[PDB]
Amino acid sequence: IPVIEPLFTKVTEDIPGAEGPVFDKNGDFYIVAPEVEVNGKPAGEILRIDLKTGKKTVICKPEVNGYGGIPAGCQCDRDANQLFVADMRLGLLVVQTDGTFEEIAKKDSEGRRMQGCNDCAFDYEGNLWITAPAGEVAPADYTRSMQEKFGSIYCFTTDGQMIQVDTAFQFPNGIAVRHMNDGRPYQLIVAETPTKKLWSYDIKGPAKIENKKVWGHIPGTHEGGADGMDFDEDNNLLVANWGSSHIEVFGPDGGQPKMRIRCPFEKPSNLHFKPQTKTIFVTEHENNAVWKFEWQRNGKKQYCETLKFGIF
Template identity: 45%
Template sequence: MAVTIELKFKKICDGLDGSEGPVFNTKGDFYAVAPMPTLEDGRVEEASQFLDKIAGNLHKVNLDTGEHEVVCTPQFEGYGGRPAGCQSDKNGNIWIADMRLGILKYSPEDGKCQQLSKVDSSGNALNGCNDLVFDKDGNLWVTGPGSPIAPSAEDRTLIFQKPSGRLYFLENGNTIPVAMDETFRFCNGIAIRDNLLLVAETMTRSIIVFDVVSSGKLSNRRVWATLPKADYDNPMNVGGPDGMDFDVNGNLLVAHHGGGHLEVFSANGVLKTRIKCPFKQPSNLHFKPASRTCYVTEHDFNGVWEFEWECEGMPMYHFTSQ
């Protein structure tokens, strides 16, 4: 039976509307995204984020002072972005999964943002993209829970009530991803360990796992773990696994959005520890390289928090030697 623990969380900053996508790049800089605009009354209006020309932001965060600055506000062809997930490549560029614009790449060196991918290899518009991870060969795996990206209007019924989520594979060096022959009920966070690819399916509270049998080829889909039930305090009663990250011992730490915990699963998918959070809606997490310090984003205070875990995080692709 899982043990619930309380660790010391320290708030680094707040004010990142819809705080998501925590990541370190190879320069040692920390970034997070604010996908949702704030209305004059201070509320985050979920529907308004999808209006034309409303753009979320990529922030660079000073972890010592809590200060953060907008370094990128993606907008293409008159449509604003909703950046959701981030990863770094070996050159320190930030790759962004965007719910309105597809797959983006931001270069800290010149401050420019590119819209790399809008369609898949079959010519179909990408689903709005939520999270992404590099494998050991520098290939990119991307979750797409949303309805098709701009200029299509968002279809919330399609996103939340139907198995319309897609999984994409972008081969190293290419810009056109391949859509896997798989569907999900809101595929969300994504992680990889050795030859296992894990995908969070939020609406079923499940972690789905695949065997990666060769480059861009998956087999043996199965449920690897299921999150505990929780009282999801929102009109749609929606919650479940969001972003996730491995530690060096092979444990998977999962942000339980709406559940108020980080759920820790053993290497074989057994829930072993529940980390109680000082907020209800953790959205993602990311380890500082070669460190036990873990950074968590959340939607109650729209902040970034840190805590110390029992071991270091598993090194990401961009911090491993090849």
């Protein structure tokens, strides 16, 4: 497998568990620090990063009834400049740029208690596909599916339903949606970290997935595996292989990586393209920092880059 070694430029530092890199509708850059703790208790943060200086600003330190959150993944909304944040303790949050936030669900569409989430991905229809590797949200005692298969997948629909679409994953992590050239969502990719697998489903409609299949194989026997992911404009899937020092690049058909990207650190966690560029921002847990490097082409447009009232 060919390996490239692009130049990684430092963006910002000292962000505990640096995760969920995302750009909003105005081009502002955000990062979440899920692993910030105060007195051994969760005190996760959502930060805005000044790309010119690398200076950090904590806009939100989510907590519900005294229970601090562990914000781990993000997706920018299209119709409003707000961020949908996957939280390991609080579930799904909607965070405004002013720092205020709301907890979306304590229970799913079936009345079952919500599970802590890690990452999410918007399809072009506005439905949010979410990975939930943690156990029940606060006030329940914190648990995570790294050893046992109790991780779930949800789909938060346009009509406000939090639907559990699958279960029994050993730490479902990164998640991505593949679209047809006409914009129709048709395939969901889900990373299962410790098992070194990428799973796929056919998206038949909002909150309707079928035919679970082992889509790709993550290299290595190191502790860790696939974390965050995103598609480039040609539908190649870039996946952060936490613990391997590489970001794997899968072709449209999956299977084995067709290329690897060597990182100057062992724990790449998540990544995100800056709109209209080849620049990929990468968070990593060796130094707990954020970097950026140039990919071969532009990223696949995120839902927030599409237009509700577009014509073409």
